[PDB]
From a paper:
SSBP1 is a key protein for the mtDNA replication machinery. SSBP1 is required to stabilize single-stranded mtDNA (ssmtDNA) and stimulate DNA synthesis by POLG. SSBP1 encodes a mitochondrial ssDNA-binding protein and interacts with POLG and TWINKLE at the mitochondrial replication fork to stimulate the synthesis of mtDNA. During replication, SSBP1 binds to ssmtDNA as a tetramer and prevents reannealing and nucleolytic attacks.
However, these structures show different sequence assignments for the 15 amino acids at the C terminus. To clarify this issue, we solved the crystal structure of SSBP1 at a higher resolution and calculated the electron density maps. Arg38 is close to the surface that (in the homologues) binds the DNA. Importantly, the guanidinium nitrogens at the end of the Arg38 side chain interact with the side-chain Glu27 carboxylate group from molB. Thus, Arg38 participates in intermolecular contacts within the dimer (the same contact occurs between Arg38 molB and Glu27 molA). Arg107 is packed against a hydrophobic pocket at the dimer interface, where it interacts with main-chain carbonyls of both molB Arg28 (intradimer contact) and molB′ Phe139 (interdimer contact). Therefore, both arginines participate in AB (and BA) dimer interactions, whereas Arg107 additionally contacts the other dimer within the tetramer. Our molecular modeling on our new, higher resolution crystal structure of SSBP1 suggests that R38Q and R107Q substitutions may affect both multimerization of SSBP1 and DNA binding. The mutated Arg38Gln shorter side chain is unable to reach this region.
Residue numbers in the entry:
A (entry chain B), E (entry chain B): 19 to 65, 80 to 141
B (entry chain C), F (entry chain C): 1 to 4
C (entry chain A), D (entry chain A): 25 to 67, 74 to 141
């Protein structure tokens, strides 16, 4: 690993979700500086199992549109990337707090 | 250059 | 009859280590490996940031699981599609913790 | 045995007119409709450009074709997935011309 | 249709292709002002049929990387949007010149 | 405002 470890070699980290919002969005600040809009999204598989996703909206403008227009029970299509949100809990345990960082949200209801 |  | 939803992930990246073929007695055999993707983004000289994201990949599908175990290698460049599953589980406490994996149902070898 | 390739389109838009159920004798029946998608992009007041793209959608799959004909309406908002096919054909001249369609294999009604 | 016909209502026009480049890329100018890199991409279906796509790269920087690194026989993954490129030919006939406008290209060979 |  160097400054020459540019890794211009490209990769792809893309998720598409279509589902229903679990609760009204909330607004948080991360570190001291980055406002974020957060809500939950439920998707289902035939197989049954409801999968509950944590959605984070960091993009300016999108995050405000999300906070004002996403509501519990909203039907949403969205796209973004997976971030696993690893961290250390109270007792040094490494946890995951997986979130989909949405860069595109389409409102269906 | 910055690497997280 | 619940309406239609979608849970679809596309990754293209480099495998982090040789896959593990895992049979924890009870649940059926699963091929496990890690996939690295890089996100580059700008912030004298051109100041640019880079983050590596490490995905855990599970392959349950019977034919794909074996193809994955035998052909995925450390450094392998692959494209894959699947769904995200968070693997909720009760620990020693009365709540749940997550073990997120991407359940691959399609893999393309690019190397 | 040719290697793996991908030809995958995702659209989400509003249908432009009631679908046509087309049986040009010979080829099997096909549901045809148009789907509009909008692309907005910036360029006093905030100067912003907008372009509407009109996609021709064909549904050949036997069960989906009928669901499409009966339930797609003008103004319907839908999500669909398919592959692009350019529909090469010889005209009255000794070369080929194209009639591009998206062959839908999955449709989600959002309205 | 007005200035109030903002159509903030969002839509999605996204194509993903993985295939082989047919010939070396060429460089064109559209109208008088927009440099573009153009090449062909072949994809196949099991069913057989080879589908030949026209790829256009307008994004600055991406278009130069494409022109310098895409070669006949290159294996490529790419993403973009469909543009049908409608026009009038010599005899007033409305033709299609469908192209995939790539905004992301990943080099595989 | 601009519309193609
Ligand atoms: Mg996509
Ligand atoms: Mg804001
Ligand atoms: Mg340039």
């Amino acid at each position: 690993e160097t400054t020459t470890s540019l890794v211009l070699e490209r990769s792809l980290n893309r998720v598409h979700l279509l589902g229903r919002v679990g609760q009204d969005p909330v607004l948080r600040q991360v570190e001291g500086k980055n406002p974020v809009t957060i809500f939950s999204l439920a998707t289902n598989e035939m197989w049954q199992k409801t999968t509950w996703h944590r959605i984070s909206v960091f993009r300016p403008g999108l995050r405000d549109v999300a906070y004002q227009y996403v509501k519990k029970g909203s039907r949403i299509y969205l796209e973004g990337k997976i971030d696993y949100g690893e961290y250390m809990d109270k007792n040094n345990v490494r946890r995951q707090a997986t979130t989909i960082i949405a860069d595109n949200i389409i409102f269906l209801s | 250059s910055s690497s997280s």
